[PDB]
Amino acid sequence: PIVQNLQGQMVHQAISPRTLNAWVKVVEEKAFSPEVIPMFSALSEGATPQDLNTMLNTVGGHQAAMQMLKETINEEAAEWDRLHPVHAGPIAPGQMREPRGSDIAGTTSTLQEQIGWMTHNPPIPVGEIYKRWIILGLNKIVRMYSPTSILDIRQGPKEPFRDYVDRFYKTLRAEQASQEVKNWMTETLLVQNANPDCKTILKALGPGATLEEMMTACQGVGGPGHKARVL
Amino acid sequence: PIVQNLQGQMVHQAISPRTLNAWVKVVEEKAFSPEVIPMFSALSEGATPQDLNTMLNTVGGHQAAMQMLKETINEEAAEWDRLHPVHAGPIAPGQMREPRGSDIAGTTSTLQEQIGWMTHNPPIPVGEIYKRWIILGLNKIVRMYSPTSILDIRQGPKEPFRDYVDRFYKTLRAEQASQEVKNWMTETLLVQNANPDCKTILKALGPGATLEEMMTACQGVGGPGHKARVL
Amino acid sequence: PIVQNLQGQMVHQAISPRTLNAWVKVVEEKAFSPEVIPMFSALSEGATPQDLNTMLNTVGGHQAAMQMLKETINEEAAEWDRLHPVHAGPIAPGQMREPRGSDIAGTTSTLQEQIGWMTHNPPIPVGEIYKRWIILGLNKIVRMYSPTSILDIRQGPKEPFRDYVDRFYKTLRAEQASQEVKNWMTETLLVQNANPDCKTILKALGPGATLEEMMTACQGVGGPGHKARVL
Amino acid sequence: PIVQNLQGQMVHQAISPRTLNAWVKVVEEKAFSPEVIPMFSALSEGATPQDLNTMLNTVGGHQAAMQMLKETINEEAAEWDRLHPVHAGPIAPGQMREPRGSDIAGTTSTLQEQIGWMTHNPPIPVGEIYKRWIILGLNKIVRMYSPTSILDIRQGPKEPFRDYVDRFYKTLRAEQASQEVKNWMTETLLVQNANPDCKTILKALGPGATLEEMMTACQGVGGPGHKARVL
Amino acid sequence: PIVQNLQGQMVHQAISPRTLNAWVKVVEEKAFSPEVIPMFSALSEGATPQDLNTMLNTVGGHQAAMQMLKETINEEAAEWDRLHPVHAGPIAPGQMREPRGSDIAGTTSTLQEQIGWMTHNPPIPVGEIYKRWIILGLNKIVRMYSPTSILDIRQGPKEPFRDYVDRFYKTLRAEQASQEVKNWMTETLLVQNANPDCKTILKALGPGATLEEMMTACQGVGGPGHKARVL
Amino acid sequence: PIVQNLQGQMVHQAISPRTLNAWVKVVEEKAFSPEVIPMFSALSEGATPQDLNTMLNTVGGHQAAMQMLKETINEEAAEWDRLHPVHAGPIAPGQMREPRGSDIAGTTSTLQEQIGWMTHNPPIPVGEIYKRWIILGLNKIVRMYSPTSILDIRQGPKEPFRDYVDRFYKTLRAEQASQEVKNWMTETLLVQNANPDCKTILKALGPGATLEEMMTACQGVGGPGHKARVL
């Protein structure tokens, strides 16, 4: 991708072999996890569509997910092109006739063509646009991996608090829906998806407070609660 | 590879030792996989034929595939020599020589002259055509590797949807077919080779469905397709 | 991150992939160990909010632990809005407008604007205050140590003195108590939970002796307070 | 070795420890293998004689092979100082002294003087000459490697076609003979060493059929072959 | 740590992650080895107190030894405040403010003043003395660690000279006492704790032998089954 | 050590910590191997005495041998102080004072003064001399290690030529003598130390023809003994 700023005009150099092997190893290890989504954003330095396309094409065993990602990139590009078409038709010389929705994608554009519009005129955010579509596609494809929905969490009699809290927050990481609505729901959910003993501990603590105080109380007990009568 | 722009005129630099170690290791771990074909394109940076030639020479286990690759390069070089512009016998003074089919290869050319025809007069696509000829050879190698075929992927009685479509996508890489063909065959084949239970779910959805719509529906249905007409 | 000043005005460099890979591997093997708290402080180079948040966002299974830390940051941001200077809405011309509690976090602040107020006019310590709140969140991570209490330690009869010293130091990493209390407690508690066989030596050495003097004497007693062979 | 053109006049650079350890590992794991011959030329960032002499001296176990190679270099040096343009003793003061055959090597030449004949006046290609002599010694070493004969690569009754091909390519890289002669022999060898059932399909395809054509026929038949024809 | 002079006046750079990961690895591999002490001196380049404290604070297993080292830093700082470069009453403003024993420490010095007095005024060895105090603490740790102390090392009935001398030099690395006494005891101790079979050979060489002379003489004795040949 | 050329005049940097760790790991995995001796020259990125001395000081393993090497250097420095240019003692004001024989070594030398005599006027070759002395000491360590000398090793009765020749060449590396003596000896040695089985083919080869001719003939023999060959 296009790198460096300090020594003058930015230079195009491919991603490091260590970085490429690290990317391949990360998806070999963590394949469908949503924890890989910010990792992809971290390696998107210089955001260059052809290099990003090449990074996308160099994936290992879980390649079916990347074929699904291609459908989203095509759909999103078509949406963007139809949303913005005002510049279409005749435009004066000295300009490079500006990228269309399909020109954003490295698969349908040439390398010299891409670099020019990111630095010879007021920079087009093509890498940023392509990156958000890929991040959006990554958010969409992790839905297929999902083994449990928010109200599908069922807790047995001998399950420990540590497993219950970890299961819920991992399940909640695949939501994407409104944060305010999620907090509001979460407060009711913890008591409802609990087992009798855990439910007794949550009921004992009563309404109010924050996660830290509830965690501090749960920490004092640990494991699968206590067994003696509450009335 | 020949590289440098910002600092001034390009210079032929040495190949990274990490890149050669990575190429040899990638061959040791996964040589026959179609995921390695984009990796070769990615690491073909600065395209010097002599440097590119080292990759074919350094290959271990799959030497027979590399031998076919050398034969393929000669046949494409023969097409370049005889069907593409042959060019005149007389050569003007000062000219850097427009390469013949034998001049492309590092074993029948010398490095300073090889650099010369890519850097003195306007660019000649010697690196790009050599990359393409190697890629054409790589595209044929997966045909000879394939242990199964696209219509030999049949969903068994209790086989889940993800494994079945993973198998279909993995063997699809081996056919080397056009985007038009992939687009028009994908719609019918998944339903056709499906088991009765899975086919019943897919059949119900019918005409007018996109791949994402079908995949989204499959996530809600789950497993090998749940049995018909008993609910 | 933000680097350079004397050798050229500051460049907005991204976090190293090598440090992210180390962070991913350290959390995987060392979990919530006290040793990672100075490592995180060191790795938070330049402390830019959006960039620093990427380390928190790239955490795997431990999403619930991250949620408590994220809640602590929101709690501290709310504390800043309420108990630290309010800041008037009307601001003089040619200003960038000083951060409110929400502005300090990368969620609602714009990266370009955030960089602008951090250094283009006399430095606002936004990264340093944000980093201190994250360290405060890491000071609450010690409450995830199941049944760990220094008052609950007991040295068994066949347990070596070195193992007991190691246990005492390991649980002493979870302190969260004032130095005066620690100084008083250490003298009496260490003798109290020590095994009788080596407790006799601690009693023999008696008051006044320092940690160095106790350790020097305790190397010579061997195993649980007496054992055969020195080789 | 000596490198640098764009930023001035060549400066001496020390060999990389990562590369040196990689050379040691390749020497340990691929010790006498024919695939090391392109690697040595590929990973040598300028064939400076003294630096190349260090590479020969850093061998572990198979010192005997390196001493045979060193003697081969001494023979080549002597032929160069006899059969090639020999430099006569009388000279007019002001030359940097045209090297003698043994001076091509780092053992009778001083490093400052050696770099001097590579930079002071028109360069003498001493590094390339030394590298070619090393390649001649490596050609001797691959004949010492050989623990079988191309005529002794017989495919057994239960041995697969790919194992026969694997063994055949392993011994082929050590065969050192003219390609035109080898290609005529290759037709004979194919039916000479193939097992009855495999030999049956090879005979059916017949001469004038490329390696790809034979692979296509053999791939369909599969394994060590089977009775009659595989349908 | 601090670096740079020719390109511009000193800049305080971040600690290397390779150094920190290496420090964790070395501690895991060989926590108490006396080869760690010069390695720590090599890794401590630039000698910045906060960066030096980062190494102390990241130790896992033998953190108890590091806590004794923390006491040692305070103990030497107390001596330094008392007897070395003492500061009296309030001094005239516009100065570094004549460092006290506490000021040397990372916990009592801010980044601005610690690097400030080093880059504005002529360089002061505050980092160098802090490093020397840490080394003094490391020297205490090896002295405490010692399993066998000086006279303990001896040669058994069947023990080779090779193992006996190896144990003596291992013991001498953790010795931490006067060099003059060490030079003197080296002359007699080796003979005294030797087995009669080897002891007579050592005495037969005559008083006054060097380590080289003793090693050369011991080559004739060597390994297992050392039957004397002195007459 | 002092390094840097293109970015301006020499700067005193430090050896990379990955390389310093690798040096320790080489000592751990290859304690007495002769391969290490040229590696020291290769890794020497600036020959500054203190940095080189630090590498010697980071040795754990074979410390008894290392102390003999260090004392050898100290004694060779003393030899320089009497046989080589000792100098009168006095020196002119406004000069870098010129190093005395002992002070070539790190023990009585300080870094600013040491750098000054390698900067101000044509460098005093203290690094080359110190490096040369270390190589002289390294040669002693392999010589001290030696299990058997050249005339103490013969080919065993069931031993093959390859194993004996490997033992001979490996052994010869540490037997410290002139190149001519080794050459002159080698011609006689093979004939006299051959076993009864292998002597038959070696005597058949006879005088005139060199080792390459003998080794080429012996490749086809079949290992040890002369069993009646089948295939």
Residues recorded for chain F: 231
DSSP state of C152: G
CB nearest B20 (choices: D43, D165, D170) = D43
Q: Residue B90: how many CB atoms within 10 A of its CB? A: 5
What's the sign of the alpha-carbon dihedral B94, B100, B104, B108?
negative
Count how many Cα atoms sit within 13 Å of the Cα of residue A130 in the half-sphere of its side chain.
29
3-state secondary structure of E12: strand
Three-state DSSP class for residue B59:
coil
Q: State the angle between helix axes of D49-57 and F36-43 in degrees (0 to 180), rounded to the nearest 10.
A: 140
CB A211 within 8 A of CB C73: no
As a whole number of angstroms, the distance between CA B212 and CA B220 comes to 13
Within 8 A by CB and 6+ apart from B190, the residues are B165, B168, B202, B214
Number of CB atoms found within 10 A of residue E139's CB:
15
Of B14, B17, B58, the CB nearest to D18: B17
List the one residue out of D58, D65, D61, D53 whose CA is nearest residue D131: D53
Question: Would you call B153 helix, strand, or coil by DSSP?
Answer: coil
Query: What number of other Cβ atoms are within 10 A of residue F156's Cβ?
Result: 11
Q: Which two tokens mark D216? A: 């296509």
Query: CB–CB of A212 and C144 under 8 A?
Result: no
Report yes or no: C136 and C72 within 8 Å, Cβ to Cβ.
Answer: yes
Best mutation target, C23, C161, C215, C218, to test chain E (most E CBs within 10 A)? C215
- What φ, ψ does residue E227 adopt, rounded to 5°? -75, 115
Q: What is the number of residues in chain E?
A: 231
Q: Amino acid identity, residue C40?
A: F
Indicate the residue type of A114. Q
- Token representation of residue A223: 């494991």
User: Using only C-alpha atoms, what is the Rg of chain C?
Assistant: 24
Method: NMR
Q: Looking at beta carbons, which residues of chain A come within 8 Å of B211? A: 68, 71
As beta bridge partners, residue D12 has D2
CA contacts within 13 A on the Cβ side of C47: 19
Chain CA centroid to CA E33, Å: 10
- SS3 call for C182: helix
User: Do D26 and D59 meet the contact criterion of CB atoms below 8 Å apart?
Assistant: no
Compute φ and ψ for F208, nearest 5 degrees.
95, -75
Other CB atoms within a 10 A radius of the CB of residue F44 amount to: 19
Neighbors of chain E by Cβ distance (3+ pairs < 8 Å): C, F
Do residues A48 and A12 lie in contact, with contact meaning Cβ atoms separated by under 8 Å? yes
Is residue A20 classed exposed, middle or buried when 0-12, 13-18 and 19+ CB atoms within 10 A define those classes? buried
Nearest by CB: A64 against B6, B35, B166 = B166
- C-alpha dist (Å) from residue F14 to E21, F11, F51: 18, 10, 8
CB contact under 8 A, F63 and E33: no
Q: How many CA atoms lie less than 13 Å away from F31 in the CB half-sphere? A: 12
E59: helix, strand or coil: coil
b/e burial code for range C212-222 (CB count within 10 A of at least 16 → b): eeebeebeebb
Determine contact, residues E53/E43, Cβ cutoff 8 Å.
no
**Amino acid of residue C192:** Q
Substitution target in B27, B162, B169, B182 with the highest count of A β-carbons within 10 Å is: B169
For residue D40, report the phi and psi dihedrals to the nearest 5 degrees.
-60, -45
Q: Chain F residues within 8 A (CB-CB) of chain D? A: 5-6, 16, 18-19, 22, 30, 33, 35, 38-39, 41-45, 165-166, 168-170, 173, 210-212, 215-216, 219, 231
Q: How far is CA B205 from CA A54, B217, E68, F164, in A?
A: 35, 9, 73, 77
The token pair at C86 is 């309010």
Give me the residues paired with residue B12 across strands. B2
Alpha helices by DSSP H, listed for E84-210, are 101-104, 111-119, 126-145, 161-173, 179-192, 196-204
User: Would the CA dihedral through C37, C41, C47, C51 be positive or negative?
Assistant: negative
- The tokens describing B151, both together, are 């219509």
Distances (CA, A) of F217 to C98, D69, D144, F206, F212: 87, 17, 10, 12, 9
Q: Do D212 and B68 touch (CB under 8 A)?
A: yes
Q: What DSSP element (H or E) covers E221?
A: none
> What is the number of other CB atoms lying within 10 angstroms of the CB of residue E16?
18
Tell me the residue type at E138: L
As a whole number of angstroms, the distance between CA B52 and CA C120 comes to 48
Q: Is C124 exposed, middle or buried (0-12, 13-18, 19+ CB in 10 A)?
A: middle
Using the CB atoms, write b or e for A38-74: b if 16+ within 10 Å. Answer: bbbbbbbbbbbbbbbbbbbbbbeeebbbbbbbbbbbb
Quick one: CA torsion of F218, F223, F229, F231, rounded to 10 degrees?
Answer: -90
DSSP-derived 3-state class of residue B11: strand
CB contact under 8 A, F38 and D20: no
User: What tokens does E229 get?
Assistant: 């040949």
Find, in chain E, the residue whose alpha carbon is nearest to that of C44. E14
Which contiguous run of DSSP H or E holds residue A3? strand A2-3
Q: Hey, how many other C-beta atoms are within 10 angstroms of the C-beta on C126? A: 21
Q: DSSP letter for D226, please.
A: -
How many Å apart are CA F49 and CA F53, to the nearest integer? Answer: 6
Letter string b/e over residues A135-148, b meaning 16 or more CB atoms within 10 A of that residue's CB:
ebbbebbbebeeee
For domain D148-221, the CATH class is mainly alpha
Give the whole-angstrom CA distance, residue D138 versus residue D68.
Answer: 10
Cα distances (Å, whole numbers) of residue B171 to A60, B138, B175, B211: 14, 16, 7, 18
| d(C-alpha B2, C-alpha B114), whole Å | 11
* End-to-end Cα separation, chain E, in angstroms: 64
Fold classified for E1-147:
Human Immunodeficiency Virus Type 1 Capsid Protein (1.10.375)
Choose among A117, A124, A102: nearest CA to A53. Answer: A102
Partner-chain contact B144 D215, CB within 8 Å: yes
- For B2, the 3-state DSSP assignment is strand
CA distances to E18, E128, F23, F44 from F19, rounded to whole Å, are 11, 24, 6, 11
Q: What tokens does F26 get?
A: 């080489």
Burial degree of F24 (CB within 10 A; 0-12, 13-18, 19+)? buried
CA C202 to the chain's CA centroid: 32
Residues 6+ apart with CB under 8 A from C72: A212, C133, C136, C137, C140
Q: Which of B113, B56, B15, B63 is nearest to D42 (CA)?
A: B15
> Residues with Cβ < 8 Å from F71, sequence gap 6 or more?
E210, E211, E212
Spatial separation of the C-alpha atoms in residues D196 and D225, rounded to whole Å: 9
CA distance F43 to chain D (A): 7
C130 and A202 Cβ atoms separated by less than 8 Å = no
Angle between helices C17-30 and C49-57 in degrees, nearest 10: 40
Longest CA span, chain E:
83
Q: Return d(Cα C202, Cα C191) in angstroms, integer.
A: 6
Reduced to 3 states, what is the DSSP secondary structure of residue B12?
strand
**Considering only CA atoms, which of E178, E125, E112 is closest in space to residue E150?**
E178
The residues near D11 (Cβ < 8 Å, ≥ 6 apart) are D2, D3, D4, F5, F6
Q: What angle do CA A178, A79, A32 make, to 5 degrees?
A: 55
CA distances from C94 to B3, B132, C89, C90, C121 (A): 45, 57, 14, 12, 10
> What residue segments make up the domains of chain E, in order of their start?
1-147, 148-221
Rounded CA-CA distance F57/F70 in Å is 9
Q: For residue B121, give every residue at least 6 positions away whose Cβ sits within 8 Å of its Cβ, in sequence order, or none.
A: B95, B96
Q: Which other chains touch chain B, taking contact as 3+ CB pairs less than 8 Å apart?
A: A, D
Q: Which residue has the tokens 């004694």?
A: F75
* Distance (Å, whole) CA E169 – CA E173: 6
In this structure, what are the phi and psi dihedrals at residue B133, rounded to the nearest 5 degrees?
Answer: -60, -40
Residue C230 phi, psi dihedral angles, 5° rounding: -115, -20
Alpha helix positions (H), chain A? 17-30, 36-42, 49-57, 63-83, 111-117, 126-145, 161-172, 179-192, 196-205, 211-221
Q: Which residue is it, tokens 């699968």?
A: A224
How many CB atoms are located within 10 Å of the residue E117 CB?
A: 19
- Cα–Cα dist D71/F169, whole Å: 13
Cα–Cα distance for residue pair B3/D199, rounded to 1 Å: 51
The rounded distance, in Å, linking the Cα atoms of C161 and C170 is 14
